[PDB]
Design a binder for this molecule. Structure first.
Ligand SMILES: Cc1cc2nc3c(=O)[nH]c(=O)nc-3n(C[C@H](O)[C@H](O)[C@H](O)COP(=O)(O)O)c2cc1C
Ligand SMILES: Nc1ccn([C@@H]2O[C@H](COP(=O)(O)OP(=O)(O)O)[C@@H](O)[C@H]2O)c(=O)n1
Ligand SMILES: [Cl-]
Ligand SMILES: [Mg+2]
Length: 134
């Protein structure tokens, strides 16, 4: 019962909001722990063929944090493989509980800035590979 989903998504730019959350040190740490890498401090948004459902997959989920008088909600994280060319890089789909962006926009995280390491630009279509269901 081995499972593969392979989803083309279009590289897109958003409202600048990824980076403040991936810079927040507890997030830096939880992703180091949960994934075995420190994400570059952003999220590569990819625009999808159709709505995405993290709950059909064997996600990790983070505890909420509270500091500076604020409540920081859980995020659901799902290891993936980012497929660019004949290359095959390891990352993760983060799906925050509360995000501004409708649900065919998935946010990707990886140790490197994907736009530089991989010369991506708004419009480019990349593929992501999800092994396993829930
Ligand atoms: C790791 C992570 C944690 C987030 N935590 C919160 C949060 O606690 N509260 C909130 O309103 N949005 C949270 N967001 C979602 C952002 O507010 C925003 O909707 C969007 O995902 C930021 O990415 P963007 O600028 O690439 O579109 C989080 C996003 C990520 C990547
Ligand atoms: N691993 C990553 C994370 C973000 N990014 C990009 O880094 C910039 C910072 O990401 P962001 O999520 O804060 O901003 P947007 O995704 O809203 O454009 C954006 O251009 C992302 O597309 C990247 O190239 N590689
Ligand atoms: Cl755009
Ligand atoms: Mg982003």
């Amino acid at each position: 019962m081995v499972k593969l989903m392979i989803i083309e998504g279009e590289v897109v730019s958003g409202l600048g909001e990824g980076r403040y959350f991936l810079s927040l040190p507890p997030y830096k740490e939880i992703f180091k722990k949960i994934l075995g890498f420190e994400p570059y401090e952003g999220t590569l948004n990819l625009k999808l063929d159709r709505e995405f459902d993290i709950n059909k997959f064997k996600y990790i989920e983070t505890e909420d944090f509270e500091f500076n008088g604020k409540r920081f909600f859980g995020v659901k994280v799902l290891p993936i493989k980012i497929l660019i060319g004949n290359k095959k890089i390891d990352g993760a789909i983060v799906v925050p509980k509360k995000t501004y962006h409708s649900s065919e926009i998935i946010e990707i995280i990886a140790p490197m800035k994907l736009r530089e390491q991989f010369n991506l630009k708004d419009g480019d279509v990349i593929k992501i590979l999800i092994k396993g269901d829930k």
